Amino acid sequence: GPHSMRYFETAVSRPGLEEPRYISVGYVDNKEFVRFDSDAENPRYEPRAPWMEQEGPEYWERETQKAKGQEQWFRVSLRNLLGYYNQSAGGSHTLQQMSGCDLGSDWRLLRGYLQFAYEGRDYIALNEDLKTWTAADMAAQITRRKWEQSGAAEHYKAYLEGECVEWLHRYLKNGNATLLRTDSPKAHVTRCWALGFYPADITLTWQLELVETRPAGDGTFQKWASQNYTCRVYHEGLPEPLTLRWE
Amino acid sequence: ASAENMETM
């Protein structure tokens, strides 16, 4: 089926400290592979999946150094925004970023993402044409015009269409261990439970009160909902939907 | 592989 990569980056400013806390978290087909964290001991892009270990110290200097840039970028930006909105001093603010790319089952580029939130509110976003911006509010217009009258979009486009695809095409080839080999739900009634599935997309029914899908810590997911009445399970990995009652 | 930002907001 289809495939994706995403980096989630958060910077949080703090009263007193002149450097914000910074976390970046990498995801492949919706599953974590790399992470950086500013607070930590002495900080770098630790791997959070075993298949990423075959990348050699060399790849980590590259990425770890990249994360150094982003802190710089997020600090300055944190302070540009304070003025844009007349936020006075001593108060806690948050800037968030999302970027990455979708691939379809043929491995070609479906679409890129590059977007931003301030205080948890949409701020500015790259349109699906990788070439123009949607700005949420009047502050974001400043950013927009800076980014127009400076060609950022193409830079991101170049990362999105090229690099993003190239490396994901590769991570895929490096770790089908807990990726391409998807597993599927074991259901039962005690309310029917689906357990053990991957990916997390699933639907449940009763035929004659939704629990949200939830990590079980080991990489699989679970859901539930509560003779006539019978439960059906729908999933990416079922070679035919499941039907049951018992008890 | 993460992306690098250029121009600030």
Added chain:
Amino acid sequence: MIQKTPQIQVYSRHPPENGKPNILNCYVTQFHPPHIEIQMLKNGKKIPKVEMSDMSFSKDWSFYILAHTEFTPTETDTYACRVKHDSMAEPKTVYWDRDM
């Protein structure tokens, strides 16, 4: 302030059977700002050694995390998750129901 109240679910990695080692999960979601304290309790006593996992956010920008620790379920004891977060005056405590 821009603030959102965390949703909480407490549950086991595996369906529980007496005296049979397992993991307990406390999944916390939909909250903002991202700072938060999560505790796991055995009979109102702070369980030692809890791993924090995730801390990223979902496409609606709101934050999620998973807390977890090792445990041998018994039916002589209570288990809960206790959360503290600027959006709530007093800590919230959700109790484990083994059928859920």
